[PDB]
Amino acid sequence: VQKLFVDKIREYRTKRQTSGGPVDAGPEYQQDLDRELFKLKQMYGKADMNTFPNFTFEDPKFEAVEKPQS
Amino acid sequence: RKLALKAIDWVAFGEIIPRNQKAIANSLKSWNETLSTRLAALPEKPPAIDWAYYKATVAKAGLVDDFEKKFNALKVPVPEDKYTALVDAEEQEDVKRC
Amino acid sequence: EVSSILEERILGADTSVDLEETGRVLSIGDGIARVHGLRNVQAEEMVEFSSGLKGMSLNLEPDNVGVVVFGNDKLIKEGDIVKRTGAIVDVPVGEELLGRVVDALGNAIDGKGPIGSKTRRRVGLKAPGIIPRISVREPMQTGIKAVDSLVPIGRGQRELIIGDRQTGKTSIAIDTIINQKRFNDGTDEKKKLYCIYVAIGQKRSTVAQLVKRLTDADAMKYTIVVSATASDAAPLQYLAPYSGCSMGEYFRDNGKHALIIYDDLSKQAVAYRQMSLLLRRPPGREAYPGDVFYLHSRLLERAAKMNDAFGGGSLTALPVIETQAGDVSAYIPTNVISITDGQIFLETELFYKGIRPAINVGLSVSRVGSAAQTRAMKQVAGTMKLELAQYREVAAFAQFGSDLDAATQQLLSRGVRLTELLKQGQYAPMAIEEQVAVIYAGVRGYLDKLEPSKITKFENAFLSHVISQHQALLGKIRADGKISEETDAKLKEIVTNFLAGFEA
Amino acid sequence: SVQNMMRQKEQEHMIRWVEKHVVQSISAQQEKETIAKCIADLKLLAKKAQAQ
Amino acid sequence: SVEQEILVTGIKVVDLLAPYAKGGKIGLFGGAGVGKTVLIMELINNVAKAHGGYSVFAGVGERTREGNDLYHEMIESGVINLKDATSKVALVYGQMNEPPGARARVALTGLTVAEYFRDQEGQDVLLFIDNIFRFTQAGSEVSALLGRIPSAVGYQPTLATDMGTMQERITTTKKGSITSVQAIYVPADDLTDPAPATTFAHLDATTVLSRAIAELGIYPAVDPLDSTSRIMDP
Amino acid sequence: SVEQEILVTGIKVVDLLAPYAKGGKIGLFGGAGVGKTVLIMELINNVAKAHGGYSVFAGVGERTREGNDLYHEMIESGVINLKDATSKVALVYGQMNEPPGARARVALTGLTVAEYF
């Protein structure tokens, strides 16, 4: 069964030799995972690839009142 | 971080006695109970930023590290203390009147 | 490096030849194969067909053998080859399963990766006898104010959650998993708890909503979920209760503590009745076989409180049972009632009258009694149980009562206000030190002048006060365990200070 | 979540090519069948000596 | 899929106490002659014309008259068009004149067309099924000649397995979404019968109709103290 | 026997209002939380004092958790003894998780021992 085994190892290395990527997928796997990630990134969040976030916040204005005693 | 203590909010601090204004003194104790729990929600120190695992797991380089180089040497300026002095200013005039 | 790991597996695979003890198929139909041959199969032994499905041989007959199928029978044609494995059914078990989703046979269905468990365990083992057990004393904390006050659960007791459809039977057993987070991140090793949840015949979308609820509360790093859903075959909903006790007995055998929830056991007696009547066994009452009592008894008797010479472990079992129109006098609602210790009876009438969780404390019992409560909770709830029981005698005078004695008007006045302390929102489990303080505010008499609609608003205000401003008192009831005379006075001016200036 | 998700997309598309491509390659190896019988029985010669 | 929404209908009892959901399985209970076919005719009136994608109606074991009052109330509203290629509704019909081997494979034929739109295309599909009690009953007639001992009150021994084999294809996956409304006959007003009391595990929103409300004149007779939903959640 | 004869056990409420015949069968109504397992442990003690006859306990399909507490409740009351031969009972326990043939013969095994004495 080792002679059957190396026959499998041959066909993995011809699958390693790629130049156009998915040969058997075609437009079916290309339209799927592009629409699948964009449906998941819409649930994930709108964040850029290199834009680091920076912002500031405003604290509450500590006001005062009057009370006449003594 | 920094954290200072306070005095007892037991008898006097909820009996400020305005012109039937026990509601304003009741709101004064209600802010101390809310902020002490919000200070108990988050600790003084945040989590640590592992830098070495960021390079291998996000190994599409350039765009990953440039945000990690700009957000690392940033600074967080806290809000101003302009209203901190004027509220403490009216305590100095009323204590001379009391 | 995706090509390298695929080439790695196929050289690491074992392609070796062996012998077998095969036998041809006679007649496949409705999920019961009849195999001719297999002259040396034991009872309840796992075989496997030619397509890839597996089978468990239940009937050892003279001229054939009746083997149920773990799948669908459209892949089994008459004239196939049924090889022998040579072993009874066994599941992987260990520490590596913590935080995974498994089916009834230990495979991974969540798609994170395969289990790395190095051990293996049978599902048909026996209970410990009379000698390796000891009486139950430690508390199992649920986090529901009505359970820990009136119907407590010890660490080794079996407690039945019985009620109709849509009354919060799954929700009582889903915050008991959430509540043990406060011990499971700390240091005290003999107070941690481990939870297992078995779903027997529910739809896949419901289990996918419940894992996300336990992922949100960060309570899927110490929980295992065993899912045998509705679409899966009839014997996989039979193994799945016995495939969870074998994962809850590895923690009992090694000095640790555990918890298991069968959701629900009334769908295992149905998935087993179908297997019986297709194997031509003599029926009985409601077409159940003669041994449905022997099916549930040897599953619940595996919950035990071990002693110190064997490790000191434990196993706690909570089965869920769905009645029909509130008739507990059926066949399966009377088998599991006479096996276990006490029941929690959730009604549907109290669910719409405002009482949520709708626990009826008139019919709920626990026969370990007060020996599983802490000393703090035992002191206040012993009078509350007597106070509520005097109210339920006189509940029928409330609709038209104003011409009664002042004691009877008082007994109504305390019963309504003790009820409002028992109501509780979903996914908010409390602590025992906070639970004893709220009961102490009510049973003493500090609420008979507050209006009955304000008892909920007063309680949420009072609890957020004593967490931040009296934290050093709720460390001297958690660590002490009892409530002394020093803490009795110290708690006394606290609820008098808050009640004085409250309404603002 | 993009670097590890898309790796599983070509992990399954890798084996989707091979198992349909093995059966079209071994169908003409009848010259390998004459040694496939000659290697089987020597394992059986190794196997029948185990019970005996 | 795990996400939940709310799909608004316009009925006052339904939207208040038991809200329906996008991509969620909905059940319409109740006896005989209380309004299960009219209430399932109302949701084709409101929901199906304002909806973007397509729609499928499978009718399993009901009167052959009422499959003609649907073909003639969907031409005059323009949903079925007999002159060009702009229709939006398919129809699959196996009625109560068929042999009992044919009333138990029609509901599997309804959700095969409705699986093409969800999987091979990506649109949002609806699905209306009336009735679905006639899938269980039509398998309890061929059973005793196939050689099976009966269970409780007269159903087959494989009752809750082939029900759960059909009801696990009507789901919302990561390739589409199927809203589904189903009418479920309850035999002689008893929700403890083994055919309606095992469909409860497969439904998110149950709308239990009742004859004790309908005999007051309150229409639609929906029981408020017996209808639930999974999204009644603050 | 050709005559009825009263068995005396010492208790004032039993031996006066609902007396016990010698040889007859007695039905004990009541369950948990009422104080039943004390009345079992005390009728063992009094017959071995006033009459001189031992007893057998037969647990027909009984729980393992509740068939362990009765072992240790009898130890702490003297009627069973781990040090010498002054015990007053013999325990037969066919527990609940056993096959349905083994839970039906326990009341026969626990009657053979009672026929020896």
Ligand SMILES: Nc1ncnc2c1ncn2[C@@H]1O[C@H](COP(=O)(O)OP(=O)(O)OP(=O)(O)O)[C@@H](O)[C@H]1O
């Ligand atoms: N304490 C509570 N307060 C208010 N609502 C609750 C509470 N507990 C549960 N519910 C609600 O009750 C509904 C059904 O509860 P749950 O599913 O737990 O009941 P169940 O009887 O276990 O369900 P099933 O009949 O499917 O087994 C849920 O929508 C949940 O929101």
Ligand SMILES: Nc1ncnc2c1ncn2[C@@H]1O[C@H](COP(=O)(O)OP(=O)(O)O)[C@@H](O)[C@H]1O
């Ligand atoms: N909008 C409505 N409100 C109340 N009752 C109705 C309504 N529409 C029809 N009905 C009543 O329901 C009965 C049965 O209608 P239908 O829904 O066709 O039957 P079924 O529900 O038994 O399939 C009719 O007799 C009719 O009087």
Ligand SMILES: [Mg+2]
């Ligand atoms: Mg539930």
Ligand SMILES: [Mg+2]
């Ligand atoms: Mg109709």
